[PDB]
Amino acid sequence: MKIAIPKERRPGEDRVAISPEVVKKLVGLGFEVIVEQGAGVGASITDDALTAAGATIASTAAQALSQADVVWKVQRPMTAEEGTDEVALIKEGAVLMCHLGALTNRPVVEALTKRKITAYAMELMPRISRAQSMDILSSQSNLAGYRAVIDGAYEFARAFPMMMTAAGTVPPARVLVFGVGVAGLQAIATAKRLGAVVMATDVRAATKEQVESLGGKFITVDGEEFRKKQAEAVLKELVKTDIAITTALIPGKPAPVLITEEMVTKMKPGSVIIDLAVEAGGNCPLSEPGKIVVKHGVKIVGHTNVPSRVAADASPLFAKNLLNFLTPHVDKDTKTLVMKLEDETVSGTCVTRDGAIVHPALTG
Amino acid sequence: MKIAIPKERRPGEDRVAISPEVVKKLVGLGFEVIVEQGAGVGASITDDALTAAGATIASTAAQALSQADVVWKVQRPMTAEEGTDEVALIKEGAVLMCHLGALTNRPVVEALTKRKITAYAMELMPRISRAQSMDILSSQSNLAGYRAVIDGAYEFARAFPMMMTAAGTVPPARVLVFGVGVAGLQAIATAKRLGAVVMATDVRAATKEQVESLGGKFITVDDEAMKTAETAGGYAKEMGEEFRKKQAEAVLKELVKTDIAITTALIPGKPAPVLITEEMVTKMKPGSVIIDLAVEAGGNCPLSEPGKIVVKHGVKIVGHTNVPSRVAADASPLFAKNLLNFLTPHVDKDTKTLVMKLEDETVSGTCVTRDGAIVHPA
Amino acid sequence: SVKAGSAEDAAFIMKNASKVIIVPGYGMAVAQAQHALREMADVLKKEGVEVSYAIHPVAGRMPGHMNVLLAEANVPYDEVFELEEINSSFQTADVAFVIGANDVTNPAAKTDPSSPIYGMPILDVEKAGTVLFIKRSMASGYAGVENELFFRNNTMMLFGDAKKMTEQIVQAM
Ligand SMILES: NC(=O)C1C=CCN([C@@H]2O[C@H](COP(=O)(O)OP(=O)(O)OC[C@H]3O[C@@H](n4cnc5c(N)ncnc54)[C@H](OP(=O)(O)O)[C@@H]3O)[C@@H](O)[C@H]2O)C1
Ligand SMILES: NC(=O)c1ccc[n+]([C@@H]2O[C@H](COP(=O)([O-])OP(=O)(O)OC[C@H]3O[C@@H](n4cnc5c(N)ncnc54)[C@H](O)[C@@H]3O)[C@@H](O)[C@H]2O)c1
């Protein structure tokens, strides 16, 4: 042990599943920490920074992964069906911890099972107070919400704050946040601190108080019936909105349409839509993955992998989630990893183990 | 009497010298306003909003300027040499007010002179407190300062604010702003708005209080020599090679721990002073960003290149051109009002004519040519 | 069964008093009590009392919830500390001013294995001489559990709105 972290090879992925801080902790647990050269370049973590923290630098991904008992990475490994057989590089009997997307990607789970790899899908972390520190959905969504506002401000041709000047006043930007989960809340905070007037809406009831606790105002004064009924008090505010930020996901199913093409026609030109739910079909039908499309005078922005647009802050937090999940199972003496099966964090997240698919949702 | 505003034909210029509010005031002064069709599209000002305000729409740039007694542009008009002749479109004997760039651009001046056109170069506004309302340098550089931080945040792979989280603490970004004029002060406010720790430096002594009022921490260098730094007009002078080394040494302690460097330093009639050399950027952290707002006047960083982001020594050096046009929808109404406040004191009550007061120091310092005679002492 | 105090009684406890740790949470954000909180901090600081802020990783309802609101209210970064940095200092602090936090301070997180909050690290506010909770009623936090700190000798319960109470606490100073 022998824990390895390769470079992320999927297009546009600049995150890495390590930091120098976490390297120091891993050798303290009794690990030889190996990492592929160039792995942290997108995250602004040089090979010298990892070496100074105690890691060994391997020249290729195969060398990095050959002898590794534990493997950490961010996105799921590529299979031979995708052209790059990354699971083949993982040692037989080893442990993989990553964002697997296991419930939507059975082929990688099958492929890992063929080599008897024990895979821990980090997205399936149980929602308990103890495992908040292990939670990659929260750590990565949070930065994506911040980014949404930075992207919106970059695409917008007016300034966010009100400015009272000698030559006249320019008003503040008006922001509307659809979906007030982790991303939406940080988008509300970032928009508000930049000086924007911020409205927000959500289906859940407790959200209204959360929106107000960041100084926003919640849209409500007074089956498919959410979509038809909601957009009336919302439409009033949407017509005045400069930046619309949509963050709503339904877990498993495609994303709910919160802004129709009809609704974007009634928006003022120079407006921008940030669709953070674009990878699940979008909250706007006009959005296209990896593209900024202009229609009806409105920019519909649909960047992929928004956490990787904050890769240098995202990667340390991801590596910490991995460390916080890992650390309780290292027997300090006798240099071993014993993943306790009574543990809810272990049982909820384990997908396959010792050559057999373990998770109830994935079993035959 | 008739006023006209064409659309900006120059590459990338999304601004316009008009707004619906300004149209209404010109109609009140006694002007028929003929804006070109789709002139405010880059500034998100519709023709309808101009029409309802009291303007008329014209189909082409030539039709808008055909009978126009006065013309407002943002940037200087393109000559026949440049690609397409806008200077010939303007009616002979009319008056022209814009950021003409008179001192650097002499061919445009003599072309306007040869058609008897009276040109008013707005960058040559005397720096007097009553003329802040009509000063295009301040209105546009203020928005450029805001935009530098947005540009910085966009090119940076980390977040600006401190956030204590379950996954660990994301520390605040450290920003350093070189030169605290109008742009630098707005860069401090906007960076502090986003939760960054902000350092700043300048040659002028009075700006130390301004940095501290905005919550930044000032970098003192030569407090003795900073009292002999500001001119009578309020602008900086060339400090010399010895101060450059004194400054570079003092700023190094903070620049090696800085994430975003915004450089805004300018000296009238001179190339922009070098504040971050290639030796200094090699000392910086990888993933760091430099925003060179002085890139069109040489650059405060030699590595910066006009209209491009340059990646070198692990650092992005950003050097966009025409930074106010990246905020064109806010920049344009303010540019229009700068022109209105310059023009308004010279329109008669019920004569229906314009008599630019030749006695006024505001008027004399601005004027370039008039009736085919270059009046400016250039 | 709770020692229920008021704005007047809670105020002079903090006046002298040599060291104060402010522990803000979701109720501080809900009330928007943060300008009034830094006001109080400046009233403590100018007299000579040591003021610091202890921020729990999951205080409020989002990552960095307390940070943005304290940044808005102009509390400086050099006075704000994370859990692992500040947990030792409660032993030396006279008072733990808990403003709208609850789950964040609950010692059932390390005591009671049956609870949903068990194993989450917490701020050790109990080690301070007195614990001032500001909180409108006896209702639970997010986790839905009772806090045993509410009803033990060293604690004082201030039943009110966090902004209203803190403003009322600033009166008596
Ligand atoms: N930060 C994140 O990213 C999170 C993501 C979602 C989940 N999350 C959880 O949330 C709580 C937050 O703990 P905190 O102590 O800040 O608050 P709580 O312990 O929940 O409760 C604070 C108290 O604030 C009070 N409260 C609520 N409103 C007010 C006002 N206006 N004034 C004063 N006090 C108020 C209220 O009691 P009351 O209703 O007054 O009886 C509450 O009991 C914690 O259990 C986290 O695991 C956090
Ligand atoms: N109408 C008016 O009265 C009027 C108009 C414009 C500006 N001003 C005043 O003039 C001052 C300058 O404003 P500006 O934005 O036009 O300045 P500017 O654009 O000419 O330059 C920006 C800043 O760079 C600084 N600088 C130059 N060389 C430097 C170096 N070597 N190292 C560090 N800093 C250096 C200058 O001191 C200045 O503050 C302000 O105080 C402003 O209020 C007045």
What do you see in this structure?
The complex is a heterotrimer, with two copies of chain A and one copy of chain C (about 170 residues). Chain A has twelve helices and 19 strands. Chain A has about 375 residues and is α/β, with parallel strands linked by helices. Chain A has two domains: about 190 residues, NAD(P)-binding Rossmann-like Domain (Rossmann fold, 3-Layer(aba) Sandwich); about 170 residues, Rossmann fold (3-Layer(aba) Sandwich), CATH 3.40.50. In chain A, the strands form four sheets. Chain A has an eight-stranded mixed beta sheet, with helices on both faces. Chain A has a seven-stranded mixed beta sheet with strand order 11-10-9-12-13-15-14, sandwiched between helices. In chain A, strand 2, helix 2 and strand 3 form a beta-alpha-beta unit. Chain A is elongated. In chain C, helix 1 packs across helix 6 and helix 3 runs parallel beside helix 6. The radius of gyration of chain C is 15 Å and the shape is globular. Classes of the chains: A alpha/beta (about 375), C alpha/beta (about 170). Chains in contact: A-B, A-C, B-C. At the A-C interface, helix 5, helix 6 and helix 7 of A face helix 2 and helix 4 of C. The structure holds ligand TXP and nicotinamide-adenine-dinucleotide. Nicotinamide-adenine-dinucleotide binds next to helix 5 and helix 6 of chain B. The PDB classes it as oxidoreductase. Keywords: Rossmann fold, NAD(H)-binding site, NADP(H)-binding site.
